[PDB]
Assembly symmetry: C4
Homo-oligomer: 127 residues x 4
Amino acid sequence: PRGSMIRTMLQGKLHRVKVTHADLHYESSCAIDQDFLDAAGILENEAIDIWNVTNGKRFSTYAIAAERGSRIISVNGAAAHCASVGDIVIIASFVTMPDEEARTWRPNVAYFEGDNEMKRTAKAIPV
Amino acid sequence: MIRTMLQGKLHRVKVTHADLHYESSCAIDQDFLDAAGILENEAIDIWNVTNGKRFSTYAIAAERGSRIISVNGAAAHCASVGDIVIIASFVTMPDEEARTWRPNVAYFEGDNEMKR
Amino acid sequence: PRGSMIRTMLQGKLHRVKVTHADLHYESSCAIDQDFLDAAGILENEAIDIWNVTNGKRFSTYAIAAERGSRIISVNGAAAHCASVGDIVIIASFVTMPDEEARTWRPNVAYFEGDNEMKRTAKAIPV
Amino acid sequence: MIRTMLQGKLHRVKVTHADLHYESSCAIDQDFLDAAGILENEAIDIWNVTNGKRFSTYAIAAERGSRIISVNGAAAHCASVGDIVIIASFVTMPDEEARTWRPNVAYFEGDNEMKR
């Protein structure tokens, strides 16, 4: 239906994941294990919102893929001023879609524990 | 040409919970979501009138009739229980439609009682 | 052309205009003389970005129409904490459109002087 | 489903002017705009690496070949001459296209000399 009202919806997110590297000298972006990107449906070059739970800072950047199985969350360049290694962050992407689709949309979510071990749900995660 | 328009909002409501343990979202009585047209998983802007902080997150439903506004997870560092917040969502549509668009608004009194 | 790349463009703006009212007790929004809205192509209920040149604060809200000829710029509710009467602000709206249109797009702009007297260009404006 | 993707960016460039008198925008050598695919009047995000400030504004053209980055008006309170900034724009497109999208990137050395 032309002219339909378009919603901004949570597409997917990495729930509390740990920052593994923060390097002011690599390009400003967040590099993320491709397995984690797959699970959250996040694309290389997609805009992402990062909330640093440890220090309260919130910022926007874009995603790049790190090696599958590396378990890397690298907050680089200018963003290395907003997160440090060991900080717990939340990484989310948002998409737009018409209202009827938005009403049944289910975001792609991944949870983490320990050594950035990825789970599908929060069931096994410590409090 | 596509415009960004106010879809709907909850005027001044009171934060009833701020649970750091829970996921980083804002949980809202489904009745309030229904009145404001805000969807579960929809991006929302929150303006905390009590402490000045503004931030973005997404909505999830709280129990219908509960009158809950819960600012949870990492968001709980932006609002405490008792703070007054404003919660809004925005939609896009072509200019032609935007010219006659009407947002969905809910007002509150007393203990998050919706003016009905 | 389906799947065409969509740009976010300055639709229009009120260049440095003076805040006339700031009232914590009216609804959080910015109320603007309808003549000024017309000149900038800004709509009632449209999302707007406000940059407060006087104090450096930047925030987002939505526009509502004040009486034609009132010359009102009223920053109300929660936004009254980001601007005061006498502050100089810039109010802008952004629209999206395909690339080819964006390449020839001309924003709708209004300039101000004195008692929120509106001009079409900066030519007559003091420095 | 529509994605928001990096359209293009100027990597670390140096601010050559910060003129408070001028309109609140960022003026950029047209050669740099050409390389990054950024348009006059397009929304841009600026990240000032030197002082940490991040803000949004819109691009306007500066004289071709001038190598100017000018952060003007109200924006001039977010960056001084000599600061290192990153300038980016974002576009939307359907998911199918987004999956193979490639941004337009320009790198710099010395005195805002584009690596060519």
